[PDB]
Design a binder for this molecule. Structure first.
Ligand SMILES: [Cl-]
Ligand SMILES: [Cl-]
Ligand code: NA
Length: 129
């Protein structure tokens, strides 16, 4: 599913991301835009052999099992394919664990390089929330 901007904002708000660990909703929408262009089916292979999955590009080296990342962890206790669903619940629930682990949203390289320190409220402006 390719989400619209305000549709994704509303779904993330319903699932409890607005101000989660202090990160306003615009931060999460901005991260999703630059990680996946709002496409739940996005995948990208990394140099080390892990793969990033879904609308927030969650990595198989630590967070999910894809059966082909030897020696990896599965800290969200899910198959990585669950992160590609049109229902974003699994992605949101795993992202809450990631952002809680000490490094906040710096875990998402595109957030650090393209959202951090910008006017992220622009990403939800005009939306009915
Ligand atoms: Cl915001
Ligand atoms: Cl933080
Ligand atoms: Na894994």
């Amino acid at each position: 599913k390719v989400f619209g901007r305000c549709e994704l904002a509303a779904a993330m708000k319903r699932h409890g991301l607005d101000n989660y660990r202090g990160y306003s909703l615009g931060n999460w929408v901005c991260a999703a835009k630059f990680e996946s262009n709002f496409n739940t089916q996005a995948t990208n292979r990394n140099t080390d052999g892990s793969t990033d999955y879904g609308i927030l590009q969650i990595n198989s080296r630590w967070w999910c099992n894809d059966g082909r990342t030897p020696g990896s962890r599965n800290l969200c206790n899910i198959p990585c394919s669950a992160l590609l669903s049109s229902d974003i619940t699994a992605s949101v629930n795993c992202a809450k664990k990631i952002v809680s682990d000490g490094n906040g949203m710096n875990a998402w390289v595109a957030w650090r390089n393209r959202c951090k320190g910008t006017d992220v409220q622009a990403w939800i402006r005009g939306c009915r929330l």
